[PDB]
Design an enzyme around this catalytic site. Structure first.
Site, mmCIF file in Angstrom:
data_model
loop_
_atom_site.group_PDB
_atom_site.id
_atom_site.type_symbol
_atom_site.label_atom_id
_atom_site.label_comp_id
_atom_site.label_asym_id
_atom_site.label_seq_id
_atom_site.Cartn_x
_atom_site.Cartn_y
_atom_site.Cartn_z
ATOM 1 N N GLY B 10 0.817 -1.165 -0.065
ATOM 2 C CA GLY B 10 -0.118 0.133 0.001
ATOM 3 C C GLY B 10 0.917 1.186 0.092
ATOM 4 C CB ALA B 99 -8.592 -1.779 -2.067
ATOM 5 N N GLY B 144 -7.129 0.496 2.080
ATOM 6 C CA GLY B 144 -7.807 -0.916 1.583
ATOM 7 C C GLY B 144 -6.935 -1.800 1.455
ATOM 8 C CB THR B 145 -3.815 -1.616 -0.658
ATOM 9 O OG1 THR B 145 -4.528 -1.437 -1.881
ATOM 10 C CG2 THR B 145 -2.552 -2.642 -0.905
ATOM 11 C CB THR B 179 -6.848 9.226 3.502
ATOM 12 O OG1 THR B 179 -6.668 7.764 3.562
ATOM 13 C CG2 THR B 179 -5.116 9.760 3.479
ATOM 14 C CD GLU B 183 -7.407 5.863 7.694
ATOM 15 O OE1 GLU B 183 -6.466 5.621 8.411
ATOM 16 O OE2 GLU B 183 -7.508 6.897 6.791
ATOM 17 C CG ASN B 206 0.409 8.154 10.821
ATOM 18 O OD1 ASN B 206 1.514 8.143 10.952
ATOM 19 N ND2 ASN B 206 -0.156 7.985 9.627
ATOM 20 C CG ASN B 228 6.788 8.279 5.940
ATOM 21 O OD1 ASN B 228 6.049 7.928 6.770
ATOM 22 N ND2 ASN B 228 6.206 8.423 4.438
ATOM 23 C CD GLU B 254 18.587 -12.444 20.273
ATOM 24 O OE1 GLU B 254 19.103 -12.892 19.152
ATOM 25 O OE2 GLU B 254 18.943 -11.843 21.039
#
Ligand SMILES: Nc1nc2c(ncn2[C@@H]2O[C@H](COP(=O)(O)OP(=O)(O)OP(=O)(O)O)[C@@H](O)[C@H]2O)c(=O)[nH]1
Ligand SMILES: Nc1nc2c(ncn2[C@@H]2O[C@H](COP(=O)(O)OP(=O)(O)O)[C@@H](O)[C@H]2O)c(=O)[nH]1
Ligand SMILES: COc1ccc(N(C)c2nc(Cl)nc3ccc(F)cc23)cc1
Ligand SMILES: [Ca+2]
Ligand SMILES: [Cl-]
Ligand SMILES: [Mg+2]
Ligand SMILES: [Mg+2]
EC number: 3.6.5.-
Lengths: 346, 437, 54, 424
Positions: B10, B99, B144-145, B179, B183, B206, B228, B254
């Site tokens: 995505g 999607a 969606g993806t 977006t 969600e 976020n 990011n 581990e």
């Protein structure tokens, strides 16, 4: 214009706070599930602290400190005092106490080691038992624990204060309720007005099965007591009369003989838990009103018995106090368009 | 030496993967064409970095990575950006239409028609692996993806690679940069379907990254690029033990061993410090004690919650920079006395510590200042269950009206999958409550 | 407070610090799920087209 | 990705022509289809609405439909007339006489297949067609009657694409014939069943805006369509311009429509412009966008609650300020936003402003107050229908009174469904 939400309708203090807030014309009330509130007067049980402070554009504030229950439920508070170095098992203002679980960790095998030393040393060995209606004050243990196990919840049993300070005329017992407000900055504010919840029945040190001269609850006294209200209206002696009595009868002030110790106890307890509950750097903020219950002994030594996390006020003092909660707890955070609190610091 | 394949799914997965692989290349001295001069073993090796890069006969170091989106625009930017040469075309897989923010459209409708192509491309990487240990899967909860295709992919990976470890880097949904209104639906659905297919998941909310950027980077309205680069710093901190010499967290097994005692509660909280703006003129460099202490401020957590009202099951400290054990122990010693740190009864109270002496690499021109020492704490506290509560609540509000459900049902999903997922989450929340109160 | 399993190397070191002791479905079932949902989808499409044909 | 556009009837074609003028200007394309803008934000998604033709030309993906040729000719002769491919002009000769039945059952049927031929040709030249937008009025005959015929034919041939419409609603204040409520009530029955998202463009709201606030004493259809084209360029900017949010017709459906039938949107616009110099501040933009007086569907938003909201700010301005102001609107009026759809207000920003404004804001609300619009139509409908008045124009084309009764019932059902969620 600020918004708030009411989730405990059965709170007299915060009902008054709702009215005061609305009557400013700068606060509007929302429905109890609307999350776009600035302020939350939360429920007493399972308040959802995990959902506060995630509403962008909203500074959010709540009237409870998550974690404060450790102070405000009887077994918890005994555990906190015994295990916290700041207070310690050598705490000189908390009575000897032990945490006992019903038959159905526990401390009765550590209890008995002390109780039998009290019986052998021929000391007064009265002990009281209670949990968080169902009270037993006895002189021998096998009545206490026998009663504990008929119920089914954790209990604390603690050294009964056999020599209390008795008000004359009347030769009667009392407890002292102090109201303390902790703000979002963790200022500890003691309200100038405390109250003495008295008994209306002379103190009978004989049989501890009569609870009318040994327990000072405003409820048990209206119903099951002989002369509820003979000496003071509603069995409530306020601070001016009590200070006058101390001066006349005992040659001291309320401030000197008692209040210094109460300020010391309050500050000690709250400063002790401040790291666990402070919201100084949190995404939401907390304040809380507490009711500290104190008992004075015949030597003018103050003792702490319970801390209540959701106390009611005295009808004479509701107005002034609730207005103070608004002034120092709420408008401090959400400003609108000679204080009644003593700040505790040392 | 055992290989690791990263899978980015995505928009949020792909863009975060870009940020991470840019970082990685900077850290290992790999140039944008894929050439690493310090690599004297030309054409191969079993070095530590080889777990993330394969080598070509021409000395090109190529990420063990697959990017997968159901629409082309975002991966097209990879195909045409600074690191185009880095990735071999077969590893950048795109669809024709996304999607539509619909879990059921990504899982069922469009997922079914590209799952086999993706698995084939993943097998082409695995077949270049002498001893593959498993997968690092990057994706949002909310897309969606990101949600639906990812859960389908996790189910399949469990079948085609059943002994291999799967790790998640998962972006949790926040209104300030979200977006879509659905969600929460997607979050719950994908969590429920993926729960048994993931060994360890690092959730990044976020909301937290956004506030960290505002408060500590003085960025007034953070973009995805800000978020990011910061998240990639955190991810690099988490994976550095797979890409460098060391004895802590050297394989994916581990991570589970050290961070997830109960297999269901596999969401470690990440706390990162220090985050310092590149535009700070005068900065006083923080000590081991100061940064370690910052590890216990909620304002530095990848997820806003209060660990004081929870219990710990594990705690790992990863340092990068000028750090030595005795300074760490000193810091811990004083912190323990001044902070509420309660472990569960059946666990040791302790810290597994990892130090790498190379301080964090920062993206030239980025927002983060260079620093002499930094730390990422990974702690499995029950307090993170607050994030599930929030999410579950937002779900319950919408689902009580069956709002928007018709969009899912119209994709082939049955209404019952909703209440099933929600029930799993109620289980999860109760597991947390029982482990930690 | 004791310090154990100290391992160290030119890139860094690692160790542990103790403070106190302790007080899947198959490929078959999956494609069956994917195909069931395709069937509900195709059916709803056919209800739609039949109504349009009316 | 690609959108196919259909404009049907007098109103459909006049507003559609204005839409293509405006957004052609926004994307730097001239009446010949040759790009001449400067920036490159203008072309990134230019294919959503334009086909590329020989010689670096841009040709709108637009089919022009009518039963009489008077308006279509007027388009060809108009400003941008020659930007449309002439093969996409599909017209009959007999008109439809403001008669839904002629458009849907008799005259329309005769012309609809060739329209679908042009549709098919445009769509097979598409890499990933996302769906269709239709412009049409609901009170006339071709737009309402034939347009809804087209919509159900398109749905049959492309059941998995998005059907979106801009549907102008009739108002006695701006009225061509008395049978407009009939034509509208039939059409809404179609719309409620066969569109995913409809923008309710109320000619009442447009008139009141031209009159009460634009201080136009005698509003023409031109003055109304200027509002319409502002609104249309606004609600489609996140479709045709690259932003953070890569939007399309289906995502807009998914996030705006919690329940299939309630897909009727109230659009708004600020600052309201007539055919000025003072720059608007972001707080002003935000307060105006939400003002009842800026909304193109004559409904009081305080008479219902918002299910979802999507807002678009065009211009160079402070994202931070926009965020603060949107949050302030919601937090200071949360009563009017349903609490059972968390975070139901989404915002998008485009750097490029519309022609002749440094900043502007477009509003897309799915409010339950939209019921007011349909209640209005239903009342007018019933006033006539209870005396079966003017029905002979319709039974003359084969229709049964029963069909009127059905359509009336389905609209009253639509009103009740809106009232359901206004109190939840
Ligand atoms: N932190 C971060 N979050 C992102 C980024 N891109 C998208 N998101 C978040 O991811 C969520 C949306 O998921 P996306 O990944 O964009 O959607 P998707 O997986 O591409 O699926 P589609 O619905 O098909 O587009 C929102 O909560 C966004 O805030 C990113 O680059 N960084
Ligand atoms: N807003 C607007 N409404 C129009 C325009 N032209 C016609 N109308 C309205 O549309 C309805 C008449 O339909 P019309 O499009 O002329 O008939 P058609 O060509 O047979 O579909 C009436 O309600 C008119 O007020 C226009 O340019 N703008
Ligand atoms: C209520 O939540 C949402 C979530 C997503 C959307 N999307 C998909 C949008 N689509 C289109 Cl075409 N234009 C928009 C303009 C502004 C905006 F903020 C969103 C959109 C709308 C509403
Ligand atoms: Ca090598
Ligand atoms: Cl395997
Ligand atoms: Mg996408
Ligand atoms: Mg006309």
């Amino acid at each position: 214009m600020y918004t708030f939400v009411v989730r405990d309708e059965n709170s007299s203090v915060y009902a008054e706070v709702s009215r005061l807030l609305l009557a400013t014309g700068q606060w509007k009330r929302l429905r109890k599930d609307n999350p776009r509130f600035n302020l939350m007067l939360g429920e007493r049980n399972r308040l959802p602290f995990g959902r506060l402070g995630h509403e962008p554009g909203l500074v959010q504030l709540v009237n409870y400190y998550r974690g404060a229950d450790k102070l405000c439920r009887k077994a918890s508070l005994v555990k906190l005092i015994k295990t916290s170095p700041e207070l310690s098992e050598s705490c000189t203002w908390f009575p000897e106490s032990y945490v006992i679980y019903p038959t159905n960790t526990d401390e009765r095998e550590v209890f008995l080691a002390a109780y039998n030393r009290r019986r052998e040393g021929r000391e007064g060995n009265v002990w009281i038992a209670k949990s968080s209606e169902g009270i037993l004050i006895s002189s021998e243990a096998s009545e206490l624990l026998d009663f504990i196990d008929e119920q089914g919840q954790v209990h604390v049993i603690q050294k009964y204060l056999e020599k209390p300070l008795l008000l004359e005329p009347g030769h009667r017992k009392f407890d002292i309720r102090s109201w303390v407000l902790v703000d979002h900055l963790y200022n500890i504010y003691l309200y100038r007005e405390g109250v003495l919840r008295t008994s209306s029945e002379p103190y009978n040190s004989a049989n501890f099965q009569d609870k009318t001269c040994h327990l000072t609850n405003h409820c048990i006294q209206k119903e099951y007591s002989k002369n509820y209200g003979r000496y003071e209206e509603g069995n409530e002696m306020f601070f001016e009369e009590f200070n006058q009595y101390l001066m006349d009868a005992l040659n001291t002030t309320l401030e000197n003989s008692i209040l210094l110790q109460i300020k010391h106890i309050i500050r000690s307890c709250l400063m002790c838990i401040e790291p666990a509950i402070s919201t100084k750097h949190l995404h939401y903020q907390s304040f809380q009103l507490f009711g500290f219950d104190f008992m004075v002994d015949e030597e003018l030594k103050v003792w702490l018995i319970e801390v209540n996390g959701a106390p009611a006020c005295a009808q004479k003092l509701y107005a002034e106090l609730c207005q103070g909660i608004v002034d120092v707890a709420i408008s401090s955070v959400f400003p609108l368009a000679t204080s009644i609190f003593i700040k505790l610091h040392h | 030496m055992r290989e690791c394949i990263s899978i980015h799914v995505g928009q949020a997965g792909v863009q975060i993967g870009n940020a991470c692989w840019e970082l990685y290349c900077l850290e290992h001295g790999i140039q944008p064409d894929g050439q690493m001069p310090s690599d004297k073993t030309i054409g191969g090796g079993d070095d530590s970095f080889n777990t993330f890069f394969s080598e070509t006969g021409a000395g090109k170091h190529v990420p063990r990575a697959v990017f997968v989106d159901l629409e082309p625009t975002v991966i097209d930017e990879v195909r045409t950006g600074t690191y185009r040469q880095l990735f071999h075309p077969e590893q950048l897989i795109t669809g024709k239409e996304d999607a539509a923010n619909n879990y059921a459209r990504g899982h069922y409708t469009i997922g079914k028609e590209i799952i086999d192509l993706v698995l084939d491309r993943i097998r082409k990487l695995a077949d270049q692996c002498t001893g593959l240990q498993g997968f690092l899967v990057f994706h949002s909860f909310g897309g969606g993806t990101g949600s639906g295709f990812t859960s389908l992919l996790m189910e399949r990976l469990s079948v085609d690679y059943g002994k291999k470890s799967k790790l998640e880097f998962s972006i949790y949904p926040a209104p300030q940069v979200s977006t879509a209104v659905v969600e929460p639906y997607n979050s719950i659905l994908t969590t429920h379907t993926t729960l048994e297919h993931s060994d360890c998941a690092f959730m990044v909310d976020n909301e937290a990254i956004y506030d960290i950027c505002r408060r500590n980077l003085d960025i007034e309205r953070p973009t995805y690029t800000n978020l990011n680069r910061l998240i990639s710093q955190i991810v690099s901190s988490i994976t550095a033990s797979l890409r460098f010499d060391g004895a802590l967290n050297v394989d994916l097994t581990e991570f589970q061993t050290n961070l997830v005692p109960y297999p269901r509660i596999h969401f470690p909280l990440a706390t990162y410090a220090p985050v310092i703006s590149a535009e700070k003129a005068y900065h006083e460099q923080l000590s081991v004690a100061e940064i370690t202490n910052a590890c216990f401020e909620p304002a530095n957590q990848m997820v806003k919650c209060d660990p004081r009202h929870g219990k710990y099951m594990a705690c790992c400290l990863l340092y990068r920079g000028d750090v030595v054990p005795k300074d760490v122990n000193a810091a811990i010693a004083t912190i323990k006395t001044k902070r509420s740190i309660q472990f569960v009864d059946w666990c040791p109270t302790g810290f597994k510590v990892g130090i790498n002496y190379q301080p964090p690499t920062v993206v030239p021109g980025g927002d983060l200042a260079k620093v002499q020492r930094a730390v990422c704490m990974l702690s499995n506290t029950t307090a993170i269950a607050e994030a599930w509560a929030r999410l579950d609540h937002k779900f319950d509000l919408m689902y009580a009206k069956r709002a928007f459900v018709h969009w899912y049902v119209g994709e082939g999903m049955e209404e019952g999958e909703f209440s099933e997922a929600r029930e799993d989450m109620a289980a999860l929340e109760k597991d947390y409550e029982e482990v930690g109160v | 407070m004791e310090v154990i399993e100290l391992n160290k190397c030119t890139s860094g070191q690692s160790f542990e610090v103790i403070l106190k002791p302790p007080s899947d479905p198959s490929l078959e079932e999956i494609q069956k799920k994917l195909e069931a949902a395709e069937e509900r989808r195709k059916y709803q499409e056919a209800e739609l087209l039949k109504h349009l044909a009316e | 990705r690609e959108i196919v556009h259909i404009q049907a009837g007098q109103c459909g074609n006049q507003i559609g022509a204005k839409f293509w003028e405006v957004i052609s200007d926004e994307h730097g394309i001239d009446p010949t289809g040759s790009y001449h803008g400067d920036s490159d934000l203008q072309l990134e998604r230019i294919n959503v609405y334009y086909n590329e033709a020989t010689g670096n030309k841009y040709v709108p993906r637009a089919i022009l439909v009518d039963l009489e040729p008077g308006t279509m000719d007027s388009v060809r002769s108009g400003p941008f007339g020659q930007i449309f491919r002439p093969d996409n002009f599909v017209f009959g000769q007999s008109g439809a006489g403001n008669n839904w039945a002629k458009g849907h059952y008799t005259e329309g049927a005769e012309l609809v297949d060739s329209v679908l031929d042009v549709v098919r040709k445009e769509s097979e030249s598409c890499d990933c067609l996302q769906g269709f937008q239709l412009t049409h009025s609901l009170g006339g005959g071709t737009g309402s009657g034939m347009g809804t015929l087209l919509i159900s034919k398109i749905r049959e041939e492309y059941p998995d694409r998005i059907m979106n419409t801009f549907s102008v609603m009739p108002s006695p204040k701006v009225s061509d014939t008395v049978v407009e409520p009939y034509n509208a009530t039939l059409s809404v029955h179609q719309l409620v069943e066969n569109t995913d998202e409809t923008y309710c463009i109320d000619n009442e709201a447009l008139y009141d805006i031209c009159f009460r606030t634009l201080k136009l004493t005698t509003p023409t259809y031109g003055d109304l369509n200027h509002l319409v084209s502002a609104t249309m360029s606004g609600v489609t900017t996140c479709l045709r311009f690259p932003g953070q949010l890569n939007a399309d017709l289906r995502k807009l459906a998914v996030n705006m429509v919690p329940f299939p039938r309630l897909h009727f949107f109230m659009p708004g616009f600020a600052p309201l412009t007539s055919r000025q110099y003072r720059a608007l501040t972001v707080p002003e933009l935000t307060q105006q966008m939400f003002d009842s007086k800026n909304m193109m569907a004559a409904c009081d938003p305080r008479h219902g609650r918002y299910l979802t909201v999507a807002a678009i700010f065009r211009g160079r301005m402070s994202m931070k300020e926009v965020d603060e102001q949107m949050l302030n609107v919601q937090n200071k009026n949360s009563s009017y936003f349903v609490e059972w759809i968390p975070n139901n207000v989404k915002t998008a920003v485009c750097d490029i402003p519309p022609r002749g404004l440094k900043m502007s804001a477009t509003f897309i609300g799915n409010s339950t107050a939209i019921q007011e619009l349909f209640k209005r139509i239903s009342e007018q409908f019933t006033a006539m229908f209870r005396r079966k008045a003017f029905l002979h124009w319709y039974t003359g084309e084969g229709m049964d009174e029963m069909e009127f009764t059905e359509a009336e019932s389905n609209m009253n059902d639509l009103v009740s469904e809106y009232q359901q969620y206004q109190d939840a």
